[PDB]
Amino acid sequence: VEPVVVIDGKGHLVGRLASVVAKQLLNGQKIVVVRAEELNISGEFFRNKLKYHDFLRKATAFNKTRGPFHFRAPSRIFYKALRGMVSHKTARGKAALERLKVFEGIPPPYDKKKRVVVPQALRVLRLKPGRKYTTLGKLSTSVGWKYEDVVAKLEAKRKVSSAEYYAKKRAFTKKVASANATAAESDVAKQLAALGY
């Protein structure tokens, strides 16, 4: 429906987000993803770390400079397990992934913009309670992403500036809501109340 969609990757699941992201791509909704270090995976840390090490040991026997790249950072993990879902070798693939832009944290301009989610991939919904999961930021930090303390800091700055925004917006919407309330019990409003507004 929109030109652009801006996903928060928090409390989310890699496979089940990758899937919908792929289909929305190949139907043509340009997508950006952010906060991928707040992402999550089913299964415990040790399981996911061993799944990563078994990939890690796989390179070309004779020359590693051409062989598989064991990318570390979380956005690139999500991109890995998305380009497995699309035909990157073709041109339709490459012209899908020229619609995908994946980041950590929320850099600009997107921090001022509307973050969304996907309910059919959330952890809290699409898992049972009383069950494990792994934080991707911690996993990447445990296999050599050397950056985790920094996105923390910038997330702090964005959080405080957004809370200071939220105060203003809450006050202003309080004012307009009080105004519309005072605008109530007036026939110009009562007609709309009859017609569902």
Binding site: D8, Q24, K114, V118, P119, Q120, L122, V124, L125
Partner: protein
């Protein structure tokens, strides 16, 4: 499938010097009439040495249960032939009608013992009108009075893919 209850009554053969072999009925569970008839011959062969050519149906009657509204804690005896040799069972159910109860039971055996419908003889199904004859706990715990319990963490299901709310259960 969506099971049904069926009366089936059969008669060995009209024959000279043995007219009207006495009668043979069964209470039978199936989706339609034909599977009832086939299960009827299948169990009826087991009881004694007769066949479909040496057999015949008297008639059948579909059985609508008398009290749909009434909860009825049933208890049922079953024999079945598993992967290994056969063995028996008694189970305890809190369901509405015999048909919905056994429809749940066949699924339950299908889960817990890989019980397909062929190898599972309904020995008997019954009602337990009073308390103090239930043995199990996974029925008993629903029966105390003033009973209440919550449904936490309802997994809602949106049709849309995106949403703008970072949702909440309740």
């Amino acid at each position: 499938a969506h099971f049904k209850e069926y009366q089936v009554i059969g008669r060995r053969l009209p024959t000279e010097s043995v007219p009207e072999p006495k009668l043979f009925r069964m209470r039978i569970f199936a989706s339609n009439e034909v599977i009832a008839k086939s299960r009827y011959w299948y169990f009826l062969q087991k009881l004694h040495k007769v066949k479909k050519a040496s057999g015949e149906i008297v008639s059948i009657n579909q059985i609508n249960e008398a009290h749909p509204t009434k909860v009825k804690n049933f208890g049922v005896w079953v024999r079945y032939d598993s992967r290994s040799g056969t063995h028996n069972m008694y189970k305890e159910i809190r369901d509405v009608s015999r048909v919905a109860a056994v429809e749940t039971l066949y699924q339950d055996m299908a889960a817990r013992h890989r019980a397909r419908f062929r190898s599972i003889h309904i020995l008997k199904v019954a009602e337990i009108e009073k308390t103090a004859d239930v043995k199990r706990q996974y029925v008993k715990q629903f029966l105390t009075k003033d009973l209440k319990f919550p449904l936490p963490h309802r997994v809602q299901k949106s049709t849309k893919t995106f949403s703008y709310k970072r949702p909440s259960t309740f």
